[PDB]
C-alpha cells in the first residue's frame, strides 16, 4: 500500500550498473 | 579503544551518496 | 570447473576502489 513498493523495485538498475563494472573491469580499454 | 571506532561511523556518508543516487535515479535531468 | 571461478575472485578490486574512498573520504583535497 502506502509505501507498498519502490525498493522492492529500482535496486537492480544498480546491479545493472554493477554489471557494466564487471566488463568496465573485464575489459577497460 | 585503540581501533575503538571509525567504521562504526563514516559508513553512512556512503549511504548519503547512495541517497543522491535514488534521486540521481528518481529524476536525472 | 565450467563456471569454476571469477567472482570467487575479482570482487576485491571493488574493495580496492572502496578503499580509495575511505581516504577519498579520510582526506579529499
Curated annotation (Swiss-Prot), chains A, B, C:
Residue(s) carrying Phosphoserine: 2
Top-level taxon: Eukaryota
Factors inducing expression: Release is stimulated by hypoglycemia and inhibited by hyperglycemia, insulin, and somatostatin.
Tissues/organs with expression: Secreted in the A cells of the islets of Langerhans.
Function statement: Plays a key role in glucose metabolism and homeostasis. Regulates blood glucose by increasing gluconeogenesis and decreasing glycolysis. A counterregulatory hormone of insulin, raises plasma glucose levels in response to insulin-induced hypoglycemia. Plays an important role in initiating and maintaining hyperglycemic conditions in diabetes.
Name assigned to this protein: Glucagon
Species this protein is from: Homo sapiens (Human)
Lineage summary: Eukaryota, Metazoa, Chordata, Craniata, Vertebrata
Gene that this sequence comes from: GCG
Residues of the full protein shown: 53 to 81 of 180
Amino acid at each position: 500500500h502506502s509505501q507498498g513498493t519502490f525498493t522492492s523495485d529500482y535496486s537492480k538498475y544498480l546491479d545493472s550498473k554493477k554489471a557494466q563494472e564487471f566488463v568496465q573491469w573485464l575489459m577497460n580499454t
